[PDB]
Amino acid sequence: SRLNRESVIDAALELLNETGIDGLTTRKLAQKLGIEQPTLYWHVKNKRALLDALAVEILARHHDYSLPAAGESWQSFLRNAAMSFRRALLRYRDGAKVHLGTRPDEKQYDTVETQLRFMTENGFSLRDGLYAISAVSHFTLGAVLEQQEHTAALNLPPLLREALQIMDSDDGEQAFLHGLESLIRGFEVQLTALLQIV
Amino acid sequence: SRLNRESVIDAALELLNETGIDGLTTRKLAQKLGIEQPTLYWHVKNKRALLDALAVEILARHHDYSLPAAGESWQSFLRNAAMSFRRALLRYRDGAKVHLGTRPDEKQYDTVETQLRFMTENGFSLRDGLYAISAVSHFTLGAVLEQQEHTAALNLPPLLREALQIMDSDDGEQAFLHGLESLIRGFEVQLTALLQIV
Ligand SMILES: [Cl-]
Ligand SMILES: [Cl-]
Ligand SMILES: [Cl-]
Ligand SMILES: [Cl-]
């Protein structure tokens, strides 16, 4: 088949969905593209390079709320960017595992830069802007990984038998959205406090 | 060597530290214990069973702040339990990945039960108690996974070149502790609000 970057990534994401991250190999990708493994190697050197590229492409294709809108509040921005990040990770099988394994791109750096500038323009120190973005990112990756890795591996007390029911309710969105508001409000409280004991 | 449960788990955790989760195999474990693979199988059927057991043992050995102290506030409890959970995951290589792959034990259920009862005794609804515990857990697993998976794979803008410096500062503790306070304060605000628009 055609072996330009875009076509290779397309095939690899389709494979990812069929196999999961642990099952994804260059040998299967070559089979999927109708080529010998040495032909693939010219284009993609190893699994690591493949996954690095997938991780970037997934956000490039699907994380379309990475930047604030004209006039958006920083609360609203973090909320929107978290939801979008979440959706993008969930779009592919083991997507969050794919994401975790990566160090960031230059574009992601331009984008992260604009995000930190935005935060600091809104009254955050560099540190606190970064801490906030990091905590959203951690909380989001954590929740998706649990949603996703719940599937990988496949008699209860009053509250817990039922904790499990409350959860086997939707995909994880309610709990996710609820903790997200709690986090943002926490940041609010912090930012508003300035040097006052809080 | 001796092949009681405890000895097998000990050897397996030591192997985990030498190999990481992806590198851990029953064949290496058997070599480490001085036995043939069919002998090991009697004791541990596969990698999956092995990892399930490790995940439980790691928290049993090292997550020693899983329950509130006499008279402890729920804020203080979540803070302490988060720090402890964090430390336990960090104690072994790929520890958070080990943890993620698991569904919980019966003991973890007794323990989680007591935690949800504690939360509800303090004024949380079941839902909100669960949402809070989940968000702490997600945020913590997220942060540790990034700390840890930062290692697995091994020119910057004013703020970001420096975002990276702020981070390459400690292990992740500062950012973690800071987001943890933000989360707890968010829960506080929520709980205190009752039915008032907040
Ligand atoms: Cl073609
Ligand atoms: Cl081509
Ligand atoms: Cl012996
Ligand atoms: Cl024995």
Tab-separated table of N, CA and C in Angstrom, chain A residues 42-188:
chain	number	residue	atom	x	y	z
A	42	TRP	N	12.450	1.005	6.872
A	42	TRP	CA	12.812	2.249	6.172
A	42	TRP	C	11.946	3.388	6.673
A	43	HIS	N	10.683	3.079	6.841
A	43	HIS	CA	9.686	4.069	7.226
A	43	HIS	C	9.535	4.267	8.737
A	44	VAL	N	9.634	3.191	9.500
A	44	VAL	CA	9.418	3.205	10.986
A	44	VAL	C	10.393	2.222	11.638
A	45	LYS	N	11.272	2.716	12.490
A	45	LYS	CA	12.475	1.943	12.858
A	45	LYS	C	12.166	0.887	13.893
A	46	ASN	N	11.218	1.190	14.791
A	46	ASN	CA	10.838	0.295	15.880
A	46	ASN	C	9.501	0.678	16.496
A	47	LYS	N	9.042	-0.188	17.390
A	47	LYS	CA	7.793	0.045	18.150
A	47	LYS	C	7.774	1.376	18.870
A	48	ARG	N	8.910	1.726	19.467
A	48	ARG	CA	9.056	2.967	20.237
A	48	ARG	C	8.803	4.190	19.368
A	49	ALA	N	9.426	4.217	18.194
A	49	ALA	CA	9.235	5.347	17.274
A	49	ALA	C	7.763	5.398	16.835
A	50	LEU	N	7.183	4.227	16.606
A	50	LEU	CA	5.810	4.107	16.190
A	50	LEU	C	4.832	4.686	17.218
A	51	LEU	N	4.992	4.274	18.454
A	51	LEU	CA	4.187	4.770	19.543
A	51	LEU	C	4.376	6.235	19.825
A	52	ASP	N	5.612	6.711	19.784
A	52	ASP	CA	5.854	8.169	19.905
A	52	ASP	C	5.030	8.929	18.867
A	53	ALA	N	5.022	8.434	17.631
A	53	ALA	CA	4.311	9.143	16.612
A	53	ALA	C	2.785	9.051	16.822
A	54	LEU	N	2.301	7.886	17.251
A	54	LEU	CA	0.879	7.727	17.454
A	54	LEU	C	0.383	8.690	18.519
A	55	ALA	N	1.140	8.749	19.610
A	55	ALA	CA	0.759	9.605	20.709
A	55	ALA	C	0.567	11.039	20.269
A	56	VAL	N	1.480	11.532	19.426
A	56	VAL	CA	1.374	12.883	18.951
A	56	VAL	C	0.195	12.998	18.017
A	57	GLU	N	-0.027	11.975	17.170
A	57	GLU	CA	-1.068	12.129	16.141
A	57	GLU	C	-2.418	12.114	16.747
A	58	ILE	N	-2.573	11.309	17.778
A	58	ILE	CA	-3.858	11.159	18.403
A	58	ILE	C	-4.328	12.542	18.913
A	59	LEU	N	-3.471	13.241	19.659
A	59	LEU	CA	-3.809	14.617	20.140
A	59	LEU	C	-3.945	15.589	19.005
A	60	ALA	N	-3.067	15.514	18.008
A	60	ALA	CA	-3.209	16.403	16.846
A	60	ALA	C	-4.549	16.223	16.131
A	61	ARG	N	-4.997	14.978	15.975
A	61	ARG	CA	-6.265	14.724	15.295
A	61	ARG	C	-7.500	15.057	16.115
A	62	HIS	N	-7.416	14.811	17.407
A	62	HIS	CA	-8.611	14.712	18.227
A	62	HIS	C	-8.689	15.591	19.429
A	63	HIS	N	-7.599	16.254	19.815
A	63	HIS	CA	-7.602	17.078	21.025
A	63	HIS	C	-7.755	18.467	20.475
A	64	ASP	N	-8.981	18.807	20.075
A	64	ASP	CA	-9.177	20.071	19.416
A	64	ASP	C	-9.522	21.229	20.352
A	65	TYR	N	-9.489	21.018	21.672
A	65	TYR	CA	-9.652	22.133	22.601
A	65	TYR	C	-8.412	22.319	23.450
A	66	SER	N	-7.303	22.535	22.770
A	66	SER	CA	-6.041	22.671	23.420
A	66	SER	C	-5.750	24.105	23.682
A	67	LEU	N	-6.545	25.039	23.120
A	67	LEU	CA	-6.247	26.482	23.276
A	67	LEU	C	-7.507	27.190	23.700
A	68	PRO	N	-7.380	28.213	24.570
A	68	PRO	CA	-8.557	29.046	24.920
A	68	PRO	C	-9.194	29.806	23.738
A	69	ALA	N	-10.482	30.079	23.849
A	69	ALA	CA	-11.194	30.833	22.844
A	69	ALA	C	-10.995	32.271	23.234
A	70	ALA	N	-11.212	33.163	22.268
A	70	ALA	CA	-11.247	34.598	22.548
A	70	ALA	C	-12.152	34.847	23.730
A	71	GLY	N	-11.571	35.461	24.739
A	71	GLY	CA	-12.336	35.898	25.868
A	71	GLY	C	-12.691	34.824	26.873
A	72	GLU	N	-12.216	33.580	26.691
A	72	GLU	CA	-12.599	32.514	27.617
A	72	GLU	C	-11.956	32.713	28.981
A	73	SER	N	-12.663	32.430	30.070
A	73	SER	CA	-12.040	32.396	31.414
A	73	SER	C	-11.036	31.237	31.573
A	74	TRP	N	-10.076	31.344	32.496
A	74	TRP	CA	-9.133	30.197	32.678
A	74	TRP	C	-9.846	28.948	33.236
A	75	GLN	N	-10.885	29.145	34.039
A	75	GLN	CA	-11.725	27.998	34.544
A	75	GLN	C	-12.341	27.193	33.406
A	76	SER	N	-12.946	27.938	32.510
A	76	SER	CA	-13.614	27.361	31.409
A	76	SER	C	-12.629	26.694	30.489
A	77	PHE	N	-11.472	27.314	30.311
A	77	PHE	CA	-10.459	26.737	29.485
A	77	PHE	C	-9.981	25.362	30.016
A	78	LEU	N	-9.540	25.317	31.270
A	78	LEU	CA	-9.142	24.048	31.868
A	78	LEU	C	-10.220	22.996	31.774
A	79	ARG	N	-11.469	23.360	31.998
A	79	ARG	CA	-12.589	22.423	31.934
A	79	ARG	C	-12.683	21.823	30.520
A	80	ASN	N	-12.814	22.711	29.536
A	80	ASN	CA	-12.868	22.318	28.130
A	80	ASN	C	-11.646	21.494	27.630
A	81	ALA	N	-10.459	21.867	28.087
A	81	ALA	CA	-9.243	21.257	27.611
A	81	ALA	C	-9.143	19.861	28.227
A	82	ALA	N	-9.645	19.731	29.455
A	82	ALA	CA	-9.676	18.445	30.156
A	82	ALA	C	-10.643	17.524	29.469
A	83	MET	N	-11.808	18.019	29.099
A	83	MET	CA	-12.813	17.147	28.475
A	83	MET	C	-12.293	16.635	27.125
A	84	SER	N	-11.661	17.540	26.421
A	84	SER	CA	-11.129	17.240	25.102
A	84	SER	C	-9.988	16.260	25.139
A	85	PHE	N	-9.090	16.461	26.090
A	85	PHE	CA	-7.980	15.574	26.344
A	85	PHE	C	-8.545	14.179	26.672
A	86	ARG	N	-9.550	14.136	27.557
A	86	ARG	CA	-10.185	12.914	27.917
A	86	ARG	C	-10.731	12.142	26.713
A	87	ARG	N	-11.530	12.834	25.900
A	87	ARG	CA	-12.133	12.279	24.692
A	87	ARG	C	-11.124	11.778	23.693
A	88	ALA	N	-10.064	12.538	23.478
A	88	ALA	CA	-8.994	12.116	22.620
A	88	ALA	C	-8.302	10.826	23.126
A	89	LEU	N	-8.023	10.750	24.423
A	89	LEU	CA	-7.421	9.511	24.939
A	89	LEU	C	-8.278	8.311	24.830
A	90	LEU	N	-9.587	8.489	25.026
A	90	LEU	CA	-10.559	7.423	24.925
A	90	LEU	C	-10.879	6.968	23.465
A	91	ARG	N	-10.549	7.759	22.473
A	91	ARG	CA	-10.919	7.412	21.128
A	91	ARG	C	-10.281	6.131	20.583
A	92	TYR	N	-9.110	5.748	21.103
A	92	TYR	CA	-8.377	4.546	20.651
A	92	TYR	C	-8.160	3.687	21.819
A	93	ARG	N	-8.119	2.382	21.567
A	93	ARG	CA	-7.850	1.332	22.579
A	93	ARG	C	-6.469	1.572	23.183
A	94	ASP	N	-6.395	1.574	24.525
A	94	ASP	CA	-5.142	1.816	25.258
A	94	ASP	C	-4.561	3.160	24.983
A	95	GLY	N	-5.426	4.094	24.590
A	95	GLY	CA	-4.971	5.386	24.197
A	95	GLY	C	-4.164	6.086	25.289
A	96	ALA	N	-4.573	5.964	26.548
A	96	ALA	CA	-3.884	6.664	27.616
A	96	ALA	C	-2.504	6.062	27.834
A	97	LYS	N	-2.388	4.765	27.719
A	97	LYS	CA	-1.080	4.059	27.752
A	97	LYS	C	-0.156	4.491	26.618
A	98	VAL	N	-0.767	4.644	25.453
A	98	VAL	CA	-0.050	5.248	24.312
A	98	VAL	C	0.482	6.644	24.651
A	99	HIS	N	-0.374	7.465	25.194
A	99	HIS	CA	0.040	8.797	25.606
A	99	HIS	C	1.142	8.873	26.670
A	100	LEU	N	1.022	8.054	27.705
A	100	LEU	CA	1.933	8.026	28.839
A	100	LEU	C	3.386	7.775	28.389
A	101	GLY	N	3.555	6.930	27.386
A	101	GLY	CA	4.873	6.433	27.051
A	101	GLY	C	5.756	7.463	26.384
A	102	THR	N	5.149	8.597	26.027
A	102	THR	CA	5.770	9.636	25.204
A	102	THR	C	6.375	10.812	25.978
A	103	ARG	N	7.426	11.386	25.380
A	103	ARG	CA	7.960	12.689	25.742
A	103	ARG	C	7.349	13.597	24.661
A	104	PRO	N	6.980	14.876	25.003
A	104	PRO	CA	6.301	15.835	24.052
A	104	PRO	C	7.084	16.426	22.817
A	105	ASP	N	6.304	16.865	21.824
A	105	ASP	CA	6.768	17.241	20.492
A	105	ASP	C	7.107	18.739	20.528
A	106	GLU	N	7.518	19.347	19.420
A	106	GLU	CA	7.815	20.793	19.422
A	106	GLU	C	6.549	21.642	19.352
A	107	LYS	N	5.574	21.119	18.611
A	107	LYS	CA	4.226	21.683	18.487
A	107	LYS	C	3.484	21.664	19.818
A	108	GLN	N	3.549	20.539	20.478
A	108	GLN	CA	2.999	20.429	21.811
A	108	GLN	C	3.639	21.450	22.777
A	109	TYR	N	4.892	21.787	22.493
A	109	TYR	CA	5.615	22.804	23.239
A	109	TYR	C	5.169	24.249	22.926
A	110	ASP	N	5.011	24.587	21.646
A	110	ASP	CA	4.342	25.820	21.258
A	110	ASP	C	2.944	25.911	21.905
A	111	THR	N	2.217	24.790	21.912
A	111	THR	CA	0.860	24.793	22.396
A	111	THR	C	0.892	24.891	23.913
A	112	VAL	N	1.806	24.162	24.551
A	112	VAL	CA	1.876	24.187	26.003
A	112	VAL	C	2.330	25.580	26.407
A	113	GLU	N	3.149	26.203	25.568
A	113	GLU	CA	3.688	27.538	25.871
A	113	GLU	C	2.564	28.545	25.950
A	114	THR	N	1.735	28.567	24.904
A	114	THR	CA	0.558	29.412	24.850
A	114	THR	C	-0.419	29.180	26.004
A	115	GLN	N	-0.504	27.945	26.465
A	115	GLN	CA	-1.333	27.608	27.598
A	115	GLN	C	-0.772	28.200	28.864
A	116	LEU	N	0.537	28.123	29.071
A	116	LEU	CA	1.173	28.679	30.278
A	116	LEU	C	1.149	30.181	30.253
A	117	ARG	N	1.315	30.774	29.072
A	117	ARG	CA	1.192	32.236	28.946
A	117	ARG	C	-0.214	32.673	29.328
A	118	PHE	N	-1.209	31.957	28.801
A	118	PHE	CA	-2.619	32.239	29.109
A	118	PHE	C	-2.894	32.232	30.625
A	119	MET	N	-2.371	31.198	31.292
A	119	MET	CA	-2.542	31.018	32.720
A	119	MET	C	-1.903	32.132	33.424
A	120	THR	N	-0.662	32.457	33.059
A	120	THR	CA	0.027	33.589	33.725
A	120	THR	C	-0.582	34.955	33.449
A	121	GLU	N	-1.117	35.157	32.250
A	121	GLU	CA	-1.874	36.387	31.966
A	121	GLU	C	-3.094	36.503	32.863
A	122	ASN	N	-3.655	35.372	33.257
A	122	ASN	CA	-4.793	35.400	34.153
A	122	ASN	C	-4.472	35.466	35.639
A	123	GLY	N	-3.244	35.668	36.028
A	123	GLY	CA	-2.923	35.917	37.439
A	123	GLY	C	-2.168	34.806	38.112
A	124	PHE	N	-2.047	33.674	37.429
A	124	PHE	CA	-1.192	32.582	37.905
A	124	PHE	C	0.266	32.941	37.775
A	125	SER	N	0.989	32.607	38.832
A	125	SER	CA	2.442	32.500	38.739
A	125	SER	C	2.777	31.353	37.767
A	126	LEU	N	4.034	31.297	37.338
A	126	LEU	CA	4.443	30.260	36.411
A	126	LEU	C	4.200	28.918	37.074
A	127	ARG	N	4.590	28.831	38.344
A	127	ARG	CA	4.638	27.627	39.126
A	127	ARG	C	3.230	27.114	39.226
A	128	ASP	N	2.339	27.992	39.694
A	128	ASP	CA	0.948	27.653	39.936
A	128	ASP	C	0.172	27.410	38.713
A	129	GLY	N	0.519	28.071	37.641
A	129	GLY	CA	-0.083	27.773	36.348
A	129	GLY	C	0.296	26.377	35.913
A	130	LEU	N	1.579	26.052	36.073
A	130	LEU	CA	2.088	24.744	35.717
A	130	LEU	C	1.494	23.677	36.643
A	131	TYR	N	1.495	23.926	37.942
A	131	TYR	CA	0.908	22.959	38.852
A	131	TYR	C	-0.578	22.625	38.511
A	132	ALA	N	-1.336	23.649	38.107
A	132	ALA	CA	-2.725	23.474	37.753
A	132	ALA	C	-2.875	22.644	36.504
A	133	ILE	N	-2.198	23.027	35.440
A	133	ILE	CA	-2.184	22.246	34.182
A	133	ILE	C	-1.723	20.827	34.463
A	134	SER	N	-0.683	20.628	35.247
A	134	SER	CA	-0.212	19.271	35.530
A	134	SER	C	-1.279	18.452	36.256
A	135	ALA	N	-1.930	19.063	37.265
A	135	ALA	CA	-2.892	18.314	38.066
A	135	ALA	C	-4.085	17.952	37.199
A	136	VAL	N	-4.536	18.849	36.322
A	136	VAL	CA	-5.612	18.455	35.409
A	136	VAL	C	-5.211	17.292	34.544
A	137	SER	N	-3.998	17.358	34.033
A	137	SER	CA	-3.506	16.343	33.172
A	137	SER	C	-3.370	15.006	33.896
A	138	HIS	N	-2.852	15.023	35.123
A	138	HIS	CA	-2.723	13.801	35.903
A	138	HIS	C	-4.035	13.151	36.284
A	139	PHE	N	-4.945	13.977	36.738
A	139	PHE	CA	-6.253	13.550	37.138
A	139	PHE	C	-6.900	12.986	35.900
A	140	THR	N	-6.756	13.637	34.765
A	140	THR	CA	-7.489	13.131	33.562
A	140	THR	C	-6.889	11.795	33.074
A	141	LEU	N	-5.587	11.727	33.019
A	141	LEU	CA	-4.900	10.515	32.533
A	141	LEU	C	-5.227	9.354	33.469
A	142	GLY	N	-5.197	9.632	34.778
A	142	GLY	CA	-5.588	8.638	35.786
A	142	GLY	C	-6.955	8.057	35.618
A	143	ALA	N	-7.945	8.934	35.486
A	143	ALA	CA	-9.310	8.492	35.277
A	143	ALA	C	-9.473	7.735	34.003
A	144	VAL	N	-8.790	8.123	32.931
A	144	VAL	CA	-9.036	7.403	31.647
A	144	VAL	C	-8.349	6.076	31.712
A	145	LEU	N	-7.136	6.044	32.227
A	145	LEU	CA	-6.461	4.799	32.372
A	145	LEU	C	-7.256	3.797	33.156
A	146	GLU	N	-7.977	4.232	34.173
A	146	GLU	CA	-8.766	3.297	34.940
A	146	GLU	C	-9.972	2.886	34.164
A	147	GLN	N	-10.605	3.813	33.485
A	147	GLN	CA	-11.676	3.417	32.587
A	147	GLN	C	-11.184	2.383	31.581
A	148	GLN	N	-10.099	2.689	30.904
A	148	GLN	CA	-9.595	1.784	29.882
A	148	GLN	C	-9.070	0.482	30.441
A	149	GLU	N	-8.283	0.519	31.529
A	149	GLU	CA	-7.532	-0.692	31.972
A	149	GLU	C	-8.431	-1.570	32.721
A	150	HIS	N	-9.611	-1.041	33.055
A	150	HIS	CA	-10.729	-1.850	33.566
A	150	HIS	C	-11.103	-2.977	32.621
A	151	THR	N	-10.948	-2.710	31.340
A	151	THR	CA	-11.284	-3.673	30.304
A	151	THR	C	-10.189	-4.731	30.063
A	152	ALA	N	-8.930	-4.280	30.024
A	152	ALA	CA	-7.737	-5.139	29.865
A	152	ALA	C	-7.882	-6.510	30.527
A	153	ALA	N	-8.026	-6.529	31.860
A	153	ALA	CA	-8.379	-7.754	32.608
A	153	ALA	C	-9.899	-7.986	32.565
A	154	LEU	N	-10.333	-8.884	31.679
A	154	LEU	CA	-11.726	-9.321	31.593
A	154	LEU	C	-11.707	-10.639	30.848
A	155	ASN	N	-20.934	-10.349	45.972
A	155	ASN	CA	-20.303	-10.736	47.230
A	155	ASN	C	-19.858	-9.495	48.045
A	156	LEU	N	-20.501	-8.350	47.803
A	156	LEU	CA	-19.916	-7.041	48.154
A	156	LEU	C	-20.623	-6.269	49.298
A	157	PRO	N	-19.851	-5.512	50.113
A	157	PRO	CA	-20.479	-4.807	51.229
A	157	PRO	C	-21.484	-3.677	50.887
A	158	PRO	N	-22.472	-3.470	51.769
A	158	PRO	CA	-23.569	-2.544	51.511
A	158	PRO	C	-23.197	-1.356	50.621
A	159	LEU	N	-22.167	-0.620	51.030
A	159	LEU	CA	-21.824	0.671	50.399
A	159	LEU	C	-21.003	0.477	49.120
A	160	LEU	N	-20.071	-0.466	49.221
A	160	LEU	CA	-19.124	-0.828	48.180
A	160	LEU	C	-19.709	-1.638	47.016
A	161	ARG	N	-20.447	-2.729	47.330
A	161	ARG	CA	-21.330	-3.420	46.362
A	161	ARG	C	-22.055	-2.384	45.587
A	162	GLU	N	-22.541	-1.421	46.327
A	162	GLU	CA	-23.127	-0.290	45.691
A	162	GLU	C	-22.126	0.853	45.164
A	163	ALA	N	-20.924	0.968	45.711
A	163	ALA	CA	-19.944	1.887	45.095
A	163	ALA	C	-19.727	1.472	43.624
A	164	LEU	N	-19.470	0.178	43.452
A	164	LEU	CA	-19.427	-0.510	42.146
A	164	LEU	C	-20.645	-0.314	41.219
A	165	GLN	N	-21.838	-0.241	41.794
A	165	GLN	CA	-23.033	0.057	41.006
A	165	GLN	C	-23.048	1.515	40.551
A	166	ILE	N	-22.879	2.448	41.483
A	166	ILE	CA	-22.762	3.852	41.119
A	166	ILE	C	-21.819	4.058	39.940
A	167	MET	N	-20.702	3.324	39.945
A	167	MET	CA	-19.698	3.375	38.859
A	167	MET	C	-20.128	2.641	37.588
A	168	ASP	N	-20.513	1.371	37.685
A	168	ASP	CA	-21.104	0.693	36.539
A	168	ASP	C	-22.464	1.339	36.279
A	169	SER	N	-22.391	2.554	35.745
A	169	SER	CA	-23.532	3.468	35.593
A	169	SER	C	-23.393	4.194	34.252
A	170	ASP	N	-22.218	4.782	34.045
A	170	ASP	CA	-21.807	5.356	32.778
A	170	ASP	C	-20.363	4.908	32.616
A	171	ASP	N	-19.675	5.542	31.680
A	171	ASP	CA	-18.314	5.232	31.331
A	171	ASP	C	-17.260	5.719	32.392
A	172	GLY	N	-17.624	6.670	33.267
A	172	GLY	CA	-16.671	7.334	34.157
A	172	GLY	C	-16.796	8.839	34.101
A	173	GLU	N	-17.641	9.336	33.194
A	173	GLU	CA	-17.824	10.760	32.923
A	173	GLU	C	-18.330	11.561	34.124
A	174	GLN	N	-19.383	11.083	34.757
A	174	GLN	CA	-19.955	11.763	35.946
A	174	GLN	C	-18.846	11.998	37.014
A	175	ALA	N	-18.163	10.921	37.408
A	175	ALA	CA	-17.141	11.015	38.443
A	175	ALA	C	-16.018	11.926	38.025
A	176	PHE	N	-15.679	11.802	36.734
A	176	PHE	CA	-14.638	12.637	36.120
A	176	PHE	C	-15.024	14.098	36.148
A	177	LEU	N	-16.217	14.408	35.653
A	177	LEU	CA	-16.674	15.815	35.639
A	177	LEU	C	-16.792	16.447	37.040
A	178	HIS	N	-17.124	15.616	37.997
A	178	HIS	CA	-17.339	16.048	39.332
A	178	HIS	C	-16.011	16.355	39.988
A	179	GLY	N	-15.045	15.466	39.853
A	179	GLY	CA	-13.725	15.752	40.359
A	179	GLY	C	-13.059	16.917	39.627
A	180	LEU	N	-13.320	17.078	38.347
A	180	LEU	CA	-12.797	18.208	37.628
A	180	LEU	C	-13.230	19.556	38.183
A	181	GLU	N	-14.523	19.705	38.500
A	181	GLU	CA	-15.010	20.920	39.139
A	181	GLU	C	-14.350	21.154	40.490
A	182	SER	N	-14.177	20.089	41.269
A	182	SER	CA	-13.534	20.198	42.558
A	182	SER	C	-12.120	20.719	42.434
A	183	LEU	N	-11.391	20.194	41.445
A	183	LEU	CA	-10.027	20.671	41.183
A	183	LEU	C	-9.983	22.122	40.784
A	184	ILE	N	-10.814	22.513	39.835
A	184	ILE	CA	-10.788	23.889	39.360
A	184	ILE	C	-11.124	24.862	40.525
A	185	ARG	N	-12.135	24.523	41.317
A	185	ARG	CA	-12.556	25.353	42.462
A	185	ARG	C	-11.395	25.463	43.438
A	186	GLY	N	-10.740	24.326	43.740
A	186	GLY	CA	-9.499	24.377	44.526
A	186	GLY	C	-8.446	25.368	43.997
A	187	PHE	N	-8.184	25.364	42.696
A	187	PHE	CA	-7.273	26.332	42.119
A	187	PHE	C	-7.719	27.762	42.284
A	188	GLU	N	-9.033	27.973	42.104
A	188	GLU	CA	-9.692	29.266	42.282
A	188	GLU	C	-9.353	29.785	43.665
